[PDB]
């Protein structure tokens, strides 16, 4: 449907359910329906054309519950629960499966890892990571997961674990140049791009791009805000950064990343300051 879709996240002062969506030919923002449940540090992806919104934190609780948006109905429904409760964890989707790695249950920074099955509606384990990681920016390229980044409990991460859907276990890769947690990730051609976070002492603007060819990272234009619990996503050859924190406050900007001049101008910015949001393109 070719729209970006932010998913709840923290204004400042609330944990949102509110959820809107940016339509490119217009350059415009609009409301969706509101999800059942206040989520911020939340995971969001879509399969078989639904959107997924899962775990997150609801100003009381970290959450295991997960409910799906259908466009047709403009519904959300709560789907089977995660075993885990989990703010701040990376999804994503994979081969008819929803991933939900990592994050906050409460008390302990997780490395355990669960997917969704639609067809039986259920969660399974699979391979934990080898770090614990809160605040990890998740994507898929080519036959593996990336796990980028992220906080063990008592570090900010440099580095980065793919799991192998053959070999169903996650290995380290090259390491990010930077420390980024609550950092943004998405997959734009064939690479990697590792957006902003927090490296122990600042909110980042800068990015760097993962090349699989050769597993090495390198420099990308940095954006023109600091933002760390940022969402990102690509639509139409280009990636988008919207909301997060600068240090002082959450952001509604949304920055857009051009391949060809390799650089970042604002679009509208969104209606909510969102910061730890999930941002998908459906
Ligand atoms: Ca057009
Ligand atoms: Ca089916
Ligand atoms: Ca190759």
Same mark, same amino acid.
Do not use: C
């Given at each position: 449907?070719?729209?970006?879709?932010?998913?709840?996240?923290?204004?400042?002062?609330?944990?949102?359910?509110?959820?809107?969506?940016?339509?490119?030919?217009? =350059?415009? &923002?609009?409301? *969706?329906? /509101?999800?059942? #449940?206040? @989520? %911020?540090? !939340?995971?969001?992806?879509? $399969? +078989?054309?639904?959107?997924?919104?899962?775990?997150?934190?609801?100003?009381?609780?970290?959450?295991?519950?997960?409910?799906?948006?259908?466009?047709?109905?403009?519904?959300?429904?709560?789907?089977?629960?995660?075993?885990?409760?989990?703010?701040?964890?990376?999804?994503?989707?994979?081969?008819?499966?929803?991933?939900?790695?990592?994050?906050?249950?409460?008390?302990?920074?997780?490395?355990?890892?669960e997917a969704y099955d639609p067809e039986? =509606?259920? &969660?399974?384990? *699979?391979? /934990?990571?080898? #770090?614990? @990681? %809160?605040? !990890?920016?998740?994507?898929? $390229? +080519?036959?593996?997961?990336?796990?980028?980044?992220?906080?063990?409990?008592?570090?900010?991460?440099?580095?980065?674990?793919?799991?192998?859907?053959?070999?169903?276990?996650?290995?380290?890769?090259?390491?990010?140049?930077?420390?980024?947690?609550?950092?943004?990730?998405?997959?734009?051609?064939?690479?990697?791009?590792?957006?902003?976070?927090?490296?122990?002492?600042?909110?980042?603007?800068?990015?760097?791009?993962?090349?699989?060819?050769? =597993?090495? &990272?390198?420099? *990308?234009? /940095?954006?023109? #805000?600091? @933002? %760390?619990? !940022?969402?990102?996503?690509? $639509? +139409?050859?280009?990636?988008?950064?919207?909301?997060?924190?600068?240090?002082?406050?959450?952001?509604?900007?949304?920055?857009?990343?051009?391949?060809?001049?390799?650089?970042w101008t604002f679009v509208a910015p969104?209606?909510?300051?969102?910061?730890?949001?999930?941002?998908?393109?459906?």
């Amino acid at each position: 449907h070719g729209h970006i879709y932010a998913v709840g996240g923290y204004d400042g002062h609330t944990h949102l359910n509110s959820v809107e969506a940016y339509d490119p030919e217009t =350059d415009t &923002w609009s409301f *969706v329906a /509101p999800m059942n #449940t206040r @989520r %911020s540090g !939340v995971g969001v992806a879509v $399969l +078989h054309n639904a959107i997924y919104a899962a775990g997150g934190y609801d100003g009381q609780d970290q959450l295991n519950s997960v409910e799906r948006y259908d466009v047709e109905t403009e519904t959300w429904t709560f789907v089977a629960p995660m075993k885990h409760r989990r703010s701040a964890l990376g999804i994503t989707v994979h081969h008819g499966h929803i991933y939900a790695v990592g994050g906050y249950d409460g008390h302990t920074h997780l490395n355990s890892v669960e997917a969704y099955d639609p067809e039986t =509606d259920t &969660w399974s384990f *699979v391979a /934990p990571m080898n #770090t614990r @990681r %809160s605040g !990890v920016g998740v994507a898929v $390229l +080519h036959n593996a997961i990336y796990a980028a980044g992220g906080y063990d409990g008592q570090d900010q991460l440099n580095s980065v674990e793919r799991y192998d859907v053959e070999t169903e276990t996650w290995t380290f890769v090259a390491p990010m140049k930077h420390r980024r947690s609550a950092l943004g990730i998405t997959v734009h051609h064939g690479h990697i791009y590792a957006v902003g976070g927090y490296d122990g002492h600042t909110h980042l603007n800068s990015v760097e791009a993962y090349d699989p060819e050769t =597993d090495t &990272w390198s420099f *990308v234009a /940095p954006m023109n #805000t600091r @933002r %760390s619990g !940022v969402g990102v996503a690509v $639509l +139409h050859n280009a990636i988008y950064a919207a909301g997060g924190y600068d240090g002082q406050d959450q952001l509604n900007s949304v920055e857009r990343y051009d391949v060809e001049t390799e650089t970042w101008t604002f679009v509208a910015p969104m209606k909510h300051r969102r910061s730890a949001l999930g941002i998908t393109v459906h």
